[PDB]
């Protein structure tokens, strides 16, 4: 794997030159006027491009991992982000994109690599900061890295992801994204993160406009006719619905956005994912709220849920039955 080794050595050499410059040019301190290393001077983008392309192959990933490729690529991304900040420079943007793509591929199904990357606190902070890049292509890439790291996150990783403020950053990112491809990656990342703990669920709900936005995603009609936005938006909503359920202000946001009506339509969807999400959301929203219970009764929710309790799918069978029994315990007068 001499060629791969050569590229990794090139990247490591460049990082060392950068770290040496950083050390000699500390904020507010005595410095000479020698300029920052520029990655173009060291042919960094082509090096990372080749590594990114190789990372699509599991045999090459094996070799890359033996050589500590993940750490080298993460170090490079971190140093470029620290040195140049949120630049619109094309060379820097593409190199960050390529590095992030390689990190996505190297974390796919890889328990050990996810843990290593999360352990790189400086790099995690740099990733989160990139969500404010004016490049939506870069945003897409960074959200995919975070999506992977959020899937089956161990105790340390969960803590790290929360400590670097990834939840608020991604939810705030989502409100601003203009490309569907970027939105898909961001919402997917939020979907995984929203499952970690109550605090992540609260942080999502606390972003001004986030709940109205998420209800909006439930009826988003894709430019490519896919269901990815409805699935992921509905997934986030399902995950955070246990907190919404106990918050009258948040329930009111859902009501003014016709959420219950939309969820009942989702119960009749042909998409397993969409039905599963809607069953979980209604499980929570059907609890402990006479207003929403009566609304669900009046809208014919009971008939719809009865048609789902015999599902062979555990989440649908569990969620539909739990929502049903919530409603049956609270029958409005006219349904006695």
């Amino acid at each position: 794997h001499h060629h791969m080794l050569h590229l990794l050595e090139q990247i490591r050499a460049y990082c060392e030159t950068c770290w040496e410059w950083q050390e000699a040019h500390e904020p507010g301190m005595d410095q000479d006027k020698n300029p920052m290393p520029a990655p173009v001077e060291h042919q960094i983008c082509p090096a990372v491009c080749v590594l990114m392309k190789l990372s699509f192959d599991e045999e090459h990933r094996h070799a890359m991992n033996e050589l500590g490729g993940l750490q080298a690529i993460a170090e490079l991304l971190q140093v470029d982000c620290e040195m140049y900040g949120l630049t619109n420079d094309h060379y820097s943007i593409t190199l960050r994109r390529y590095a992030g793509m390689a990190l996505t591929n190297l974390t796919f199904g890889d328990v050990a690599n996810k843990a290593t990357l999360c352990s790189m606190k400086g790099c995690m902070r740099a990733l989160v900061a990139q969500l404010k890049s004016e490049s939506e292509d870069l945003q897409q890439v960074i959200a995919s890295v975070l999506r992977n790291l959020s899937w089956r996150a161990d105790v340390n990783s969960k803590k790290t992801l929360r400590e670097v403020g990834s939840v608020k950053a991604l939810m705030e990112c989502a409100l601003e994204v203009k490309k569907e491809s970027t939105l898909k990656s961001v919402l997917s990342a939020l979907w995984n993160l929203s499952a970690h703990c109550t605090e992540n669920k609260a942080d999502i709900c606390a972003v001004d406009g986030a709940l109205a936005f998420l209800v909006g995603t439930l009826t988003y009609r894709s430019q490519t006719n896919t269901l990815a936005i409805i699935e992921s938006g509905g997934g986030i909503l399902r995950n955070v619905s246990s907190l919404i359920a106990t918050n009258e202000d948040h329930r009111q946001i859902l009501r003014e956005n016709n959420c219950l009506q939309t969820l009942l339509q989702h119960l009749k969807s042909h998409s397993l994912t969409i039905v599963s999400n809607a069953c979980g959301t209604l499980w929570n929203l059907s609890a402990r709220n006479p207003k929403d219970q009566e609304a669900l009764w009046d809208m014919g929710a009971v008939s719809m849920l009865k048609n789902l309790i015999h599902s062979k799918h555990k989440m649908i069978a569990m969620g539909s039955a739990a929502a049903l029994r919530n409603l049956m315990a609270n029958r409005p007068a006219k349904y006695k």
């Binding site: 990114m52 990372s55 699509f56 992030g100 793509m101 390689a102 996505t104 591929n105 974390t107 796919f108 199904g109 890439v141 995919s144 999506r147 992977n148 899937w151 990656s185 997917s188 979907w191 995984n192 929203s194 499952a195 699935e231 992921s232 997934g235 399902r238 995950n239 994912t273 599963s276 999400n277 979980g280 989440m315």
Partner: peptide
């Protein structure tokens, strides 16, 4: 709770 697993780049 629900989730969507891992993804490959691009």
């Amino acid at each position: 709770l629900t989730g969507c697993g891992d993804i490959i780049a691009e």
